Amino acid sequence: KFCKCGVRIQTSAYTCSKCRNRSGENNSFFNHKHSDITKSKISEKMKGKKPSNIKKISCDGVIFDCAADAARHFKISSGLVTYRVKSDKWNWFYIN
DNA sequence: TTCTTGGGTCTACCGTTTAAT
DNA sequence: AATTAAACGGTAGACCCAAGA
Ligand SMILES: [Zn+2]
């Protein structure tokens, strides 16, 4: 048996692994809902994890791994951190 | 039967914007 | 002006599940 792409496949298969459609409505989990139990398992494993989009920052010399840590140290909102970084009245800048 | 794939369904936390003070 | 909350928009990684191998 041959896949539409040209490679051989078992007669029990509809396509080769690479050509299988899994996007949108063709996904095996499309339109399914996760149970409250699954959501909790995901919740516990994620608690305390910082994401990859964090920005190291220097607050005029005092550095932080992310803007949120700086917000928590100064006790201000994250929005204000961004505001000071853009302000000509502060020397707060992201590293890189 | 098991092991592998890989993208839809989620969570926790980020950072930037903007309405409202 | 300088502030905050909430609206938006993003990442990786855990989960699920059917079908390829
Ligand atoms: Zn193919």
Q: If DSSP codes are grouped into helix, strand and coil, which group holds residue A92?
A: strand
Residue A23 is encoded by which pair of tokens?
């996007």
In angstroms, this model's resolution equals 2.2
Q: How far is the CA of A54 from the C1' of B12 (A)?
A: 13
Rounded CA-CA distance A12/A34 in Å is 30
Nearest to A18 by CA among A39, A34, A4: A4
Nearest-5° Cα angle at A95, A68 to A64: 35
Q: Which residues contact A74 (CB under 8 A, 6 or more apart)?
A: A59, A81
Rounded CA-CA distance A90/A18 in Å is 53
SS3 per residue for A28-63: CCCCCCCCHHHHHHHHHHHCCCCCCCCCCEEECCEE
Q: Which residues contact A81 (CB under 8 A, 6 or more apart)?
A: A57, A67, A68, A70, A71, A74, A92
| Footprint on protein of nucleic strand C, Cβ below 7 A | A 7, 9-10, 12-18, 20, 28-29, 32, 34, 38, 41-42, 45-46, 51-53, 75-80, 83, 87, 89
| CB A23 within 8 Å of CB A30 | no
Q: How far is the CA of A21 from the C1' of C2 (A)?
A: 52
